[model samples]
Structure formats: structure tokens, C-alpha cells
Target: PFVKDFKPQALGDTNLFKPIKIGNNELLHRAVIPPLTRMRAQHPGNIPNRDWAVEYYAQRAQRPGTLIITEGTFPSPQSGGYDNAPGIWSEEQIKEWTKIFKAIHENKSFAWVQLWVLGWAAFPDTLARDGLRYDSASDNVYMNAEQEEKAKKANNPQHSITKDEIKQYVKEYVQAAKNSIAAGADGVEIHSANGYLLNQFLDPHSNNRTDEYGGSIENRARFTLEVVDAVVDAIGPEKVGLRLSPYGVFNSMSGGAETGIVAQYAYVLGELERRAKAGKRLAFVHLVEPRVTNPFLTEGEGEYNGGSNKFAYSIWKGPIIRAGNFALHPEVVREEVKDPRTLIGYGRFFISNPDLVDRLEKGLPLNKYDRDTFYKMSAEGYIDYPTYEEALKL
Candidate 1:
């Protein structure tokens, strides 16, 4: 009988610790922080507390390797779902975000503001409260009972968006990127993942329409391509990035395991690759593996190995950043670094350890994150996570 030693190995020599050039900027290391929704803003108004957000990011930016991605920010009133989430569509929001970006940059860290639109996932009560109507790729399904009631009260039941309306949606996405630039962000990441607006268009079941934005793979990818092009045009492609969950099934989204899913993503990624080769290359492509599960939501059946997805690796020509379950088990990330182009990202680890890079560097253990306080409107779990030294004594 042969015994195998599987002890934790240091990641110093791995590409995960190496620097990579992105656009005109070069990251000191390969660790990134993917956007995690923390509904800690001023509720009812959906305005971020400048000091809180700035402080939170400034602390994390202490590590040069940590490429901070701000939480999902709604691009328009109709694009929102959560009550306390941040938005970049308004002047006030831009001012608040400007202060945040300044704080992060002063710490010598680069940050990308992620843009999102909830589409059908937009809460009925939230849209009504905001004096907006619920509009999605197709109103073929309701998220929940509350959303249904809100639609009735607004006298605008969920319905498929018109072709003209989709064009308007594309403009809104582009405007959001411009707003982020105006707010002083290094760049903007289009949130086409997680069953959001653009994702809804990609999902055949969610977007059961006979229009140009539905049916075939090319049609399904039309909306996302348009938004991508618009954003790239507004801000140079060098300052833009994208996120996608090709196999995600959260938020009642289908097509993760259905036929033609691969072809659908291939078409989308193909267009992006074409743009990159044509010198309109985006900053990077952030990918979320399917095994990465959110305890609060239903999981998908997609098995994604970001470093080993040959199809994606072949099609995506720019930097490829991955996030999923890397924090709890960094050994997996070290293995992923075998692909020189791969970079690692974490969500919960950064939340629990502001000095995440320092802890990792010194081989110090990480503090477990408090899920209960994650979305609470307070500083308890948001910024109170102790450093490695402080946690040792506890």
C-alpha cells in the first residue's frame, strides 16, 4: 500500500503570485476580489454611505495584489432589485462613488465598478417604490408572489420588452459605464452573470421571444454583444471587463444543463474574441466556476474548471480571472495557476480578512466569515473583521 502526502503547499512559486499586464496597467499579483452583494447602503434611497464604502475598500486595498471589484450597482431605477444596494445612475450616487474611488486609488489600488441590471429579478415592491415599472427580456415568469402583486398595483404586469426598449437598455448600460468613469473608477465590469438582465437574454427559457434578441444562439447573444460594444465604445476596450456564469441556474434561470448552452456561450465568447483580436480587447474576463455555491440560493449543475475550460481558454484571448471556492481551499487555486494566464479571486475571504494578502503571505490562518451579518446594515461584519495577529489571540 502506498500512502500519499497531501499537506498544504506554499503558493509562492505559482503564477497566482506573479504579476500580469492588463491593458496599460500591471497588477502586482494575481489575486482579485469578485463583486459580492452587500446590501449595506442607505435603504429606501439605495444610496451608499460614502465613508463606509470608502473605508471598506481602502482597508482592502492595503494589499497590492487585491484587485478590488465594487459590489453590483444598478444602472437605472428599473434595473434594481435589492432595497439597499448601490446605484450609479444618479448624480448623488456618482459623487459618493467618486469619493470611494479616490480613497481606493490613494491606497495605491485599482478598482473596477461592476454594472448590473436585475431585469425580471427586479423586486416588484422596489420598482413600485422607485416609481418605475418591472421590465425584463421576457415577462414569461414571475420571481415571486410579491413581484406579481407589485406588477398589478403598478398596472403594468410583466411583459416582454420591445426591440426598441432593448436598444434603450443597451444605452442605459453604456451610460452606467460612463457614470462609473465620471466617478473615477479605474474601469467597469459588465455584470452579465448571475441571472441578471443580460443573462436573462442569454437564457433561452427566460427569454422566450420571437424577436431578434431570442431563439437562435446568435439572437440570444445579441443583447449582450450590443451592450458590450456600447460600453467598449464609451470607455476604451482597455478599461472594460466582463463577467459571465454560462452554467449558472440561480434566480430560476434555465439553460445551464439544456442543449445548445455551449453553442450559446461559444457565440458570445467568439464575438468577444473577435473584438479582442481586432484591437478592441477588453481588460479581462472574470469567470465564476459552477462549483462555487451560494448557500442562500439554489445551486446549478454546471461543472466549470476555469483554468481547464479549453473552449473558453481558446476563445478568451485576454487575461482570465477566476473566482468561486478558492478562498477556503487555496491549494485548488495553486493548481489552477498552472495556466499562466489564470488569476485567482475570492469573495468571502476578503470579507473576513481585510489583510488577506498579508495573512496568506505569512501562512496565517484566516478568520471565518459571519454570514448572518453579511447583508446587515452595520459595521459589525462589513469592516470589523480582525487581522491575522488580532485573530491569533482570540
Candidate 2:
């Protein structure tokens, strides 16, 4: 609604179609397909070696210059938050994911692996069964009623991680980044959103510790910064990226919607901007707009701030990718490109349209995604979507 019929100096020469330099690499376009988990990993190891994932990513890579961030992958046993999700911790997993990188590179596209560690969010039962530990910044539990009921019924309970343990976890993140590069990926995106380990530490509602890794804003952000620094050291900063959800409440994570949020992110962004300015520039900063994801919440509606992009834009001074239901109004992407540093990210739309770039270019109607088959363990909704030309014949 803000950019309707709003043309900028670029006019027809919008930044969306132009190549932009990131680090030493140059992207073909500004249209990026953010990480979307298909839940298609069939092997016991949860490796992406199956032909299904290969076919899925390869089909989406049909459009050149389109950057693809692979689905969030578990970096360690303690981080196995979702069942059937892919992993990059083991050597076997790396061998399997290499195929995907090959397929993406064949299409002249780049692939980045998303490294994730779900601290307290890890299912207690799963952790107990796997003999893994359930750890978080503090012992504070923020699960929803349903989840709390399940936890009570379950035999296992979550635990608070010690400061020394956190140091080890940071090393694990570093190893995961090295593994990603060894697996043929061009880079790695640290998953700090959606109430995962990094996010849990950032939200005071979940983390109430007084250690160096907690308390003040700088302390709350220390773990994330350490992980980022280690990852950048493991792999060049140019090949690194970070994702954050300033107003996101998913998975029981929270920020001071009124004043806490601005202050919280301001400190983090200031540090990140400092690093970028110091010649440690990252690939891009991906943000999920709450107005697009959590539309039900409004200003003064509750504790969360919905319109965070304006403030975030002021803090993060680098390439930024925004995604949150932008598929419904494709034209909104035009407004995003006007900033030049801002790029549009398609989530659900990219799932159903393998030729999403072409569809947008030709102004063709998109196929609706089947909600039932979204996380189903089959190829029906994974790679069965037809392109615009094929849809006409159907």
C-alpha cells in the first residue's frame, strides 16, 4: 500500500533486475527465495541426499540469478528441533548436501546453508531418547499452553545450560559453518530467528540470567556475536549472513514491543553495523516483517511492535532481504527495490511456482499451494507444481 504506483529514479531500471555485488560475489538479481523446509528428507539420517530434495531445489533454480537459502538445518544433536529436518553436522550429511549445491550451481545460482540450533525449543522427549541435553540461556520456560501440557505429560524435562557449555556450543556453530563450506555451499546464514537458541537468549521473557551471556543488552547479544565472529573467522564474512525477527513471538520468544524492542535491536544492529563498516561485511540481513507474518497484532494492540521495518532500516546499513506474505501483492516488491539495498523474498509463492521469476515477469497467475501437502512426506506438493506454460496445457 505504501509503494503503489510509486516510481523511483531507477524507473524501469529497477534494482530487482540488476546484479548487485555482495562481498566478492555478484548476485544475478534481487529476487531471493528464502529458506522453506519441505520436510522431504526420507533417510534415517535426515540427509538431503534424496533425489526429492535435489529435484525440488533444481527445479526452483531454473531461474538464473535467484539466490536460494536452503532450509534451516540442525547443526548438532542438541539442535534437532524438528523431525525430518535436514542436518549438516555429520560427514555423511555433507556428502548428501553436496549434490544440492551442484544442482544449484549448474543453474548459475548460489546456495547458502542455514545453520540452526534450537536450545530450549528442542522437544524434551526427543532429547531424552537421543541421550542429548536440553539447554537454554536460563531455566525460564515460555511454552504455550498446549506445549506446556505436552511437556508435563512427557517424562523428560528441559535444563539450563552453564556458561562453560555455551562456550562449547559456540564452537559447534563454528564447526557447522566450516562443514557448510566444505559441503560445497558458497556460504552460511545463521538462524537467529523464530525463537531458536540465539533468539531465546535475546528475549528476556525466556532468558533471565545474570551472567556475562545475559542481563544487559550487550550480554544478551554476546552469544550471538561470539557465534557470528567464530563463523566469520571460520568462513569469510562476505560469505556469511544473519536472520532476525525483531517483533516475532513464534516459539515463545519476545522483544519489548514498545520500548524494549527498539533498545534491544539497536544495540545488536549497532554492533553488526560496526563489524560491516570494519570491512567484515556480511552477505545480507534477512528480516521477517510482522505486518506480513503476524498481521493480527496491531500498534498498541499488545506488547509487540508490528511495523519494525522502518526502524530496522535505520539500523542495519547493508543489503537487506524482506519476506512476509509479499507473494499476494507482487507489486509490493517494486516498492522494496526502490531502496536498492532492499530485496524481496518469496516464501510460499516460491514453493508452488518453480518458475516463480518467469511467472512474475509475465504477470501470470500463480497456482495455489496445498496446505495439507506442505509438510507431507511426499513429492505431490514438493515438485509437482506446474509452470505457467504447463499450467495452461493442464
Candidate 3:
């Protein structure tokens, strides 16, 4: 396989729109516009609006050779732990997302929803005010021992969740998958990574329990598997994808000193491989590279804090997509994708440039992302980044 336009030949026969099988679905291209969160929702519910979201996503939609996965969208109302995020759980929200779908379809690019549930991150006061807690949303939970200590709970006074409540979130997660399909998403990838609700269940530190959802490796991974099955049932397995952070410590999640993270992740990947065949419709498995530095999460000491992408592909039998700082060095990415087991993603690069594939094809320099605009209150840094042509004129 030879390299052409920066994309490895193993990516496909062509630079863009070349089809390759990933899991149960065929991707339109190797360039996947990674999911990015910019708090651009409008009004009281933080629901994605016609004007704000249309213009913002439209910029990304300008390129047809890449697949676009929108920001972390809450599947349920209470799952919106962060201030102003998007959701697909509600009817109105689904209608709102339809506008985005139309634009992506018009551009001839495929789009999917990154379904999320912020369990332990669910702050009671903020959620209760919105009337979207466990009683209202099921994902409602206070802090467990580790989270309490990490969050300074004695003074903070947060709540804890029960086993029954977690079950409810699983059902809601299924609906969220269906909602994504209804909202015009081609499929849905359960936000099982990132130390979110699903990851909380998988991470021993956040979930210190003797229950089925927590204990040995299987139990810790049970929540994510269940959610994946739910999404499979909702949207068919072909449209479902899962991302994992085996050693990720985000949201105060540590795998515990007893169970080595490397061993734990190996087991998790093995299980996912089995379930993917069992489910018969599961899509690609996206793994975060443990060696890459996340703008959101850092390395612990000298150890690489990133998730194990190399290890994951070894165990996982399906198509494996690698994400992280690879955007900074496409040449390294070019070499990595030679194995035919990996697909590359650029988290920060997808933000500013609407024509990332074109830029890569021409070997053009990229625009530096503004750290301040990442999750700001407005669209300045979030959506105001110029394209390569726009930057060239300057």
C-alpha cells in the first residue's frame, strides 16, 4: 500500500469516499471528524437551535470525504451534566437535530451521534433545578466513596445512586440510541469512554460496589456492554460503535492499584470482541491511544496516561479507529494506518478547518486551535476558527 494525499493506502483505494468495512458498517472515508463539544446551545434547555447549530456544523459539513460525529450529546435530560450541551432524548430536540442531519446529507457525508450519560458527574443542585434527576432521569446519583473524596463531598454534600437507578439509565440509554436514529443520525456510538457514566461503572475507583455492575473485570465492564447491547437493539448493531479509555483517570476514575490497568483493558477488549460477534451488528471499535496526550486529560507521572490503542487492536478483531494527538503529526499517522487495522482521527484539527482532508491532501499547514475558545460561552473560539484558504489570505 502506498501513501497518497497523506492518507495511507490501507485506509482505502482512494483518498476520500473510498469505502471500507468497519464492524458491520462500511465507512465512506478514513477521515472521521471526531466528536467535539463546544457549548453552543441556545436558551433555557440548552437545546440545539436552527441558527446556532446549523452555521456551526455547516462549516464542518463543507467537506464530503469525512464522517462527522457531533459533540457529546446527552441521551437523557438528566444526562446533561455539563451546562449548555445538546440532547436527543426529547422530541423537540430530535426535530432540532433533523436540521443538522439535512445539512450533512446535503453535503453527502455521513453523521452519527455520540450518545452520552454523565452519571456521577450529575450534580444534584443543577439537575434537581431542571427536574431531571434519578426520580426524573434515572442517571441521578450522588458521590460514591472515591468520588466523594475526590470532590470534597463532606463540605459539598452531593448525593449517591442506588443499583435500581443504574438499571433505569440502561433503558434510557437504549431509547437514546433510537432517538439518535430518529434525529437522522446514521447510527450512535455509546459514550462509554471518557470516565462518563458507562466508564464510571467500568472504573473501580468511581464504582466501589459488590454488585454485578462492579467487582471483577466483567462486572466493571458490564454497564458498557449492556448499553452497547441496548443501542444494538435500538439502532441495529451495524450502526453502533463503542470507545474505551482503559487506563483513563478522567472524572476521578482510577482502575485501583490491585487490578493492573493493562490486564483489565485486555479483558475488556476481549469481551467486546466476543460481544460484537454475538450481537452480529456492532460497528467499529474506537480506542484512544495511551501514549497520546489529551488536551482534556494528562499523563500520570512519566507513564503514558492515554488509553491502549495498540493493545486494543491486538485483542479486538474488528476495525479499530485510533484517536488522540495524531492530528499534530499526520506523517506518523500515515505510518500507523499501514497495518490496515487503524483509522486516524484529529480532535482539534476538525474544529477550525472545514476541509481537513483537502488540507492533508495538499500537505498544508493547519490552523492552531485557541485553547480559550474550546468550551467557552460563545462561538468566538468555538466556531469562529478560519478555514485553510481563509487563513492563507491572511
Best by lDDT: 1
Query: Higher-TM-score candidate among 1 and 2?
Result: 1
On the 0 to 100 scale, the lDDT of residue 230 in model 1 is 95
**What tens-digit string does per-residue lDDT give for candidate 1 at 292-345?**
533254222244433234568878877888877676565787788889888887
TM-score for candidate 2: 0.91
Task: Rank the models by TM-score, top first.
Answer: 1, 2, 3
Number of backbone collisions per candidate, in order?
A: 0, 0, 6
- Model 3: what TM-score? 0.85
Ranking by lDDT: 1, 2, 3
After superposing candidate 1 on the true structure, give the runs of residues whose Cα lies further than 4 Å from its correct spot.
Answer: 1-9, 144-156, 293-308
Q: Which tens-of-lDDT digit does each residue in 1-394 have in candidate 3?
A: 1112233222233333346766433566677777788877654665885556877777777766456778888877767666678888777788889888888778877778898787766554556556554221122333455644533432334434466776777788888888788778887888877677777777666666666766677877777787777778767878888877665555655632325667767887787778766756367777766544344643223236333357776788877767776655555666776666567766776776666666666666666666677776676865666776777667
TM-score of each: 0.92, 0.91, 0.85
Query: Looking at candidate 3, what is the lDDT of residue 177?
Result: 82
Question: lDDT at 87 for candidate 3?
Answer: 83
